[PDB]
Amino acid sequence: EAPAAVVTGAAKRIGRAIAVKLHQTGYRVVIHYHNSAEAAVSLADELNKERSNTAVVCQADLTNSNVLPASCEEIINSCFRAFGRCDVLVNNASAFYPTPLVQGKTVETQVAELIGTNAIAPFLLTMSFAQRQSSNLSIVNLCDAMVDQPCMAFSLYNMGKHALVGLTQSAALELAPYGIRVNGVAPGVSLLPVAMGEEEKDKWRRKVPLGRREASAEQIADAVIFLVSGSAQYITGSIIKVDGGLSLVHA
Amino acid sequence: EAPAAVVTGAAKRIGRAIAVKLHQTGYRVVIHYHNSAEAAVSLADELNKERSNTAVVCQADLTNSNVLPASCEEIINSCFRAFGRCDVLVNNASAFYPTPLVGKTVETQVAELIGTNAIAPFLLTMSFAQRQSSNLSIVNLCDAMVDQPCMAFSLYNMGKHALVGLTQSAALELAPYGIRVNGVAPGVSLLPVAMGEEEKDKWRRKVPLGRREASAEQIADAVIFLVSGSAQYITGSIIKVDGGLSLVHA
Amino acid sequence: EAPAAVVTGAAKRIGRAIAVKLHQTGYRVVIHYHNSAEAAVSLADELNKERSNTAVVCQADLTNSNVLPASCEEIINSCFRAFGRCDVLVNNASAFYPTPLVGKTVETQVAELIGTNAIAPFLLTMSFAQRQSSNLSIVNLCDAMVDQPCMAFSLYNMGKHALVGLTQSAALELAPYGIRVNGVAPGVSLLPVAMGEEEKDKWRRKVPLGRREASAEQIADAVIFLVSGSAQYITGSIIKVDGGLSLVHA
Amino acid sequence: EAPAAVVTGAAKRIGRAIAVKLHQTGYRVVIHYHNSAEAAVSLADELNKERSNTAVVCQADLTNSNVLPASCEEIINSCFRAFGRCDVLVNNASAFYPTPLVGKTVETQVAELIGTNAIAPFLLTMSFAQRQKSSNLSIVNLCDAMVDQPCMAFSLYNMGKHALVGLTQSAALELAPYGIRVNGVAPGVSLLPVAMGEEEKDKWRRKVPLGRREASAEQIADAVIFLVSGSAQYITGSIIKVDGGLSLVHA
Ligand SMILES: NC(=O)c1ccc[n+]([C@@H]2O[C@H](COP(=O)([O-])OP(=O)(O)OC[C@H]3O[C@@H](n4cnc5c(N)ncnc54)[C@H](OP(=O)(O)O)[C@@H]3O)[C@@H](O)[C@H]2O)c1
Ligand SMILES: NC(=O)c1ccc[n+]([C@@H]2O[C@H](COP(=O)([O-])OP(=O)(O)OC[C@H]3O[C@@H](n4cnc5c(N)ncnc54)[C@H](OP(=O)(O)O)[C@@H]3O)[C@@H](O)[C@H]2O)c1
Ligand SMILES: NC(=O)c1ccc[n+]([C@@H]2O[C@H](COP(=O)([O-])OP(=O)(O)OC[C@H]3O[C@@H](n4cnc5c(N)ncnc54)[C@H](OP(=O)(O)O)[C@@H]3O)[C@@H](O)[C@H]2O)c1
Ligand SMILES: NC(=O)c1ccc[n+]([C@@H]2O[C@H](COP(=O)([O-])OP(=O)(O)OC[C@H]3O[C@@H](n4cnc5c(N)ncnc54)[C@H](OP(=O)(O)O)[C@@H]3O)[C@@H](O)[C@H]2O)c1
Ligand SMILES: Cc1ccc(-c2c[nH]c3nc(N)[nH]c(=O)c23)cc1
Ligand SMILES: Cc1ccc(-c2c[nH]c3nc(N)[nH]c(=O)c23)cc1
Ligand SMILES: Cc1ccc(-c2c[nH]c3nc(N)[nH]c(=O)c23)cc1
Numbered sequence A: 001e002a003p004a005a006v007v008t009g010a011a012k013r014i015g016r017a018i019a020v021k022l023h024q025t026g027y028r029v030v031i032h033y034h035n036s037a038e039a040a041v042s043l044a045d046e047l048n049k050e051r052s053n054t055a056v057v058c059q060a061d062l063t064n065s066n067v068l069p070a071s072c073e074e075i076i077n078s079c080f081r082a083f084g085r086c087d088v089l090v091n092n093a094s095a096f097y098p099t100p101l102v103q104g105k106t107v108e109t110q111v112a113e114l115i116g117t118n119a120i121a122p123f124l125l126t127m128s129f130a131q132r133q134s135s136n137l138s139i140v141n142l143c144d145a146m147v148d149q150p151c152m153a154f155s156l157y158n159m160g161k162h163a164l165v166g167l168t169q170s171a172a173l174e175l176a177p178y179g180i181r182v183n184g185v186a187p188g189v190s191l192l193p194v195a196m197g198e199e200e201k202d203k204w205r206r207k208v209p210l211g212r213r214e215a216s217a218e219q220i221a222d223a224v225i226f227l228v229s230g231s232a233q234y235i236t237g238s239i240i241k242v243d244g245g246l247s248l249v250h251a
Numbered sequence B, C: 001e002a003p004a005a006v007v008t009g010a011a012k013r014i015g016r017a018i019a020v021k022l023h024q025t026g027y028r029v030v031i032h033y034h035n036s037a038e039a040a041v042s043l044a045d046e047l048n049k050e051r052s053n054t055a056v057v058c059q060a061d062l063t064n065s066n067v068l069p070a071s072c073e074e075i076i077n078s079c080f081r082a083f084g085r086c087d088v089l090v091n092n093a094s095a096f097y098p099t100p101l102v103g104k105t106v107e108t109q110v111a112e113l114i115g116t117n118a119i120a121p122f123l124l125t126m127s128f129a130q131r132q133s134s135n136l137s138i139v140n141l142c143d144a145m146v147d148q149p150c151m152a153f154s155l156y157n158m159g160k161h162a163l164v165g166l167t168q169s170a171a172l173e174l175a176p177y178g179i180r181v182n183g184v185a186p187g188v189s190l191l192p193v194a195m196g197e198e199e200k201d202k203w204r205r206k207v208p209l210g211r212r213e214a215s216a217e218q219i220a221d222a223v224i225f226l227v228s229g230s231a232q233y234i235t236g237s238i239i240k241v242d243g244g245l246s247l248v249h250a
Numbered sequence D: 001e002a003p004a005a006v007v008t009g010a011a012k013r014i015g016r017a018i019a020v021k022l023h024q025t026g027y028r029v030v031i032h033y034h035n036s037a038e039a040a041v042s043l044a045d046e047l048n049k050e051r052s053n054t055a056v057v058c059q060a061d062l063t064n065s066n067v068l069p070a071s072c073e074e075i076i077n078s079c080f081r082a083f084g085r086c087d088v089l090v091n092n093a094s095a096f097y098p099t100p101l102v103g104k105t106v107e108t109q110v111a112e113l114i115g116t117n118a119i120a121p122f123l124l125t126m127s128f129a130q131r132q133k134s135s136n137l138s139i140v141n142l143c144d145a146m147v148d149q150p151c152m153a154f155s156l157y158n159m160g161k162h163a164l165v166g167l168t169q170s171a172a173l174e175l176a177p178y179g180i181r182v183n184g185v186a187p188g189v190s191l192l193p194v195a196m197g198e199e200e201k202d203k204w205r206r207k208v209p210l211g212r213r214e215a216s217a218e219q220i221a222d223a224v225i226f227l228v229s230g231s232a233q234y235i236t237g238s239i240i241k242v243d244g245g246l247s248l249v250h251a
């Protein structure tokens, strides 16, 4: 019987690439999304056309609130409801925007969205994943290769991603006895933002030593599939940079 | 006249030591506290008896919530209302207890542990910076053991990791204003009052330098250095004060 | 036609498993060795029996000395002599023993520990680069415990740190030629051959993931990944393969 | 009576500032140098004119060789010969130049860059510890804040400074039971090379978040003085960046 994976924010871009590559490898998938309903359903349609009854969608806001634990518990539940098991969790969903320290959304909302999606939701999903559990169980957290050389005015986002590194490490430690491995993949510049202009995209491209280009979504996904695979059976607590050398380059 | 500092969680233990040492250096201080009202007020008395009009208290819960931004703004304000300036911020207040992955609801655990260790420091940093030769700086109390965390302390460790990110991000962003941002990372210091000596001693034996915990004063020494004129080029730095504990393999 | 790889210290244990998996994946291999001539020869014989003339041996001392650059150049030359190309370099050979601060001379200890773990990797990297659809890469066998080192292993640990520096510096510098440079960092793998099981168990008990040492094959799996087409954007990265060992506090 | 310190490469620049501040603090000092004899002697004259019999010079090449252990032992011995004790060792001397991967031989590059930056510090540390067989004994290694974002084509120099981090950690661990603390100070840009032109200096200056300028030698020295002081008695294995935020800056 085929294993199953939850991928958060899987409707587009890197999350979709991850869900697609897991599915190609044999997995049944829960494609979680927040606002991108059409794209999520369109992906599940494609995957199910390849293998019937192997993809479902699951909608949730991963902003921090007092109900976030329930929402995270329900995402995991949806995987057991559809597929009878949950082998893999990939924490990919993420809010990303500037939050300058010195002077739209209130700061309360900024905290809730940036820390919720990048850190607290991954924590709650990890709790729920673990509580529901031979086989090959693991979690992969999408981290950021540039956490120690952050973008200017992205403190909350950066705090969130640092917290995600602590979760990766703390959860690797605590869940090791249950056979659940916990690891990360840390992109540098991969698929650039949709709203970014081509000139600014090129400025970022020229900073990458290996090939002067951004990582493809498939390149990020490749690292994810390695860590979930049997070829990574002794690996836990590890974060693999997939950044083409970007984090090595001084100002 | 004399510079002013806010120290969060300053009524006892390390925060008290820090407040006292800053006061001894010539600072006026805002003693923030949450539940330890008697100790805070008694500390303010002692400091004011030493030098008049150099200490006040400010109570606040630093648990994350929709009112935390206001609370943090008011802590910073209390320094300007009392002293007319705010030169140093020390983010010391911290919740610490296990939150296993398998009485408090989990959402309360999140709020307390991520609030006190990370979000409150961010919000105080915002308010500090907005309200601004001078020697302005922030010192965050981090943890030397963040990469080898205590078992079942996920949320606490996430909080201290986020604090490292804030230290770096704020160092970068506030550098144009001359505000330095740094950390001090204890290993074992003091030990919990509720811990029995037998368990205390197991920890002491782990420390290479002396087989003892740090005194609060030793932690405070590092904070004093970072706020001083002898650290004017230092920002984004985290100084371990751990007697080598983080270097010791399992 | 088939790509080719140099694996240093490939006659036994982890380096042997690396060479075997590389060969299994389709590479022709240079099995470098120092003392273990029978095992190296026997391995090349095994691999050549599988596929004709897909393995050769190359002996060299990788201790630092005035002849080390020439020896390293000749290792790379041996790959081109045998196979007409050199796609992959795996710096695996390593001396490992204590060098307390307080019957080899210290200058010999320096030469062996720093030479095998760092200088030879550098010299091999130079020679590999100078000699250059294409998937060119280097993988350095680092150490997950480099920041929590064994007591009295300062020169070894210095070597392994220098090897991290080389991994990063070379990733940057060689990126414009399409040569990727990465590492794999074991925690405990295999354990020493003569170590009593009761001592082995003390180490095993420390590993969170399964309370056991890694197999040689599990380390090799990571190397295969880094050399593969699935890692073609990965450079300057060091993958721990340690079962969580480096996360465990004292 | 007055404690004594050895500062390597102390005739000029940062090592000179260190020696001076140690002396202003009450230490007697061994001014080690290699080629800068006139400067070393001039500094010893200035210090002794301030307080007679409190400075000596000591010449040694710290290039790696089979006699490097003897040279390092003699440096420490010279402090004991002059002053009867050796309380502080500051490993400051350092060769620095490019060694690309693709007039000096490579064996000479290796010996100089790895010798000065790493092996000599190890040997000096050994000899310091062994001679210790009322006091605040410690070692301070001059590291580099940019070791993880290294200058292009500086691999041997970078390998040296990384080994120096490992030494700092390994020796802190091993020497702790003897009451000897071992720490580091990690500049980013300080002073700038004497060779460097005004335009190129300003280019580097502009990179620094805190003040858009290089650190003074005295600013580096301040941190060294802190680490040797009674205010750092629980600090060992710590490396303090003194870089004005430079290492936080992405490409
Ligand atoms: N792109 C890069 O260069 C890069 C660089 C460094 C790190 N990373 C990391 O790699 C991962 C993927 O990057 P990406 O660029 O593909 O991400 P992205 O497009 O920015 O975000 C992925 C998804 O996050 C979901 N999301 C955002 N806010 C949410 C909320 N409040 N609740 C629930 N879901 C929410 C969105 O779902 P809907 O669209 O369904 O609303 C979105 O599709 C992220 O974890 C990211 O931080 C990426
Ligand atoms: N002790 C150690 O060994 C050690 C080790 C590593 C890092 N550190 C760090 O060093 C710092 C000081 O350590 P410590 O042992 O002195 O701390 P602590 O005694 O655990 O706590 C310091 C203070 O934090 C305040 N606090 C807790 N929850 C709060 C809330 N919800 N809102 C506002 N304030 C709250 C408390 O104030 P009230 O008492 O007034 O309620 C408490 O006195 C902390 O940041 C800690 O994480 C300490
Ligand atoms: N095993 C572990 O738990 C562990 C942990 C952390 C890191 N690592 C790293 O993983 C790698 C492989 O580990 P391992 O345990 O398999 O290593 P090992 O058995 O200790 O050594 C590997 C080989 O290194 C070669 N070697 C030693 N001195 C040499 C010299 N002077 N010149 C040339 N070659 C020399 C030897 O070749 P001959 O036999 O032919 O003389 C030896 O078979 C090493 O880089 C190691 O540091 C291993
Ligand atoms: N300057 C910076 O921006 C910067 C940045 C990062 C790190 N650092 C570190 O801080 C320390 C001091 O920096 P710096 O710019 O002041 O250093 P420097 O001027 O480049 O070199 C310091 C001294 O090293 C000695 N030295 C060089 N080769 C030697 C050899 N073979 N044997 C013995 N001694 C030798 C020289 O002594 P003689 O003059 O007597 O020949 C020289 O005065 C160094 O460790 C450096 O790596 C500096
Ligand atoms: C140039 C450029 C633009 C964006 C990123 C980026 C980093 N982390 C992110 N997390 C989310 N969720 N989405 C993103 O787009 C990014 C990195 C470099
Ligand atoms: C044995 C032992 C006990 C406690 C600590 C400790 C770490 N971080 C902390 N943060 C707060 N706020 N309070 C604490 O007490 C601690 C570490 C080791
Ligand atoms: C108990 C125990 C024994 C050895 C190791 C070990 C670490 N690094 C090593 N490098 C080489 N070359 N050979 C080794 O054997 C080791 C780790 C733990």
Ligand SMILES: Cc1ccc(-c2c[nH]c3nc(N)[nH]c(=O)c23)cc1
Pocket (backbone or CB within 6 Å): D093, D094, D095, D096, D144, D188, D189, D190, D192, D193, D204
């Ligand atoms: C622009 C610029 C120039 C030099 C440095 C520098 C780094 N590490 C060094 N070590 C020694 N010994 N001497 C140096 O001068 C430097 C850094 C930035």
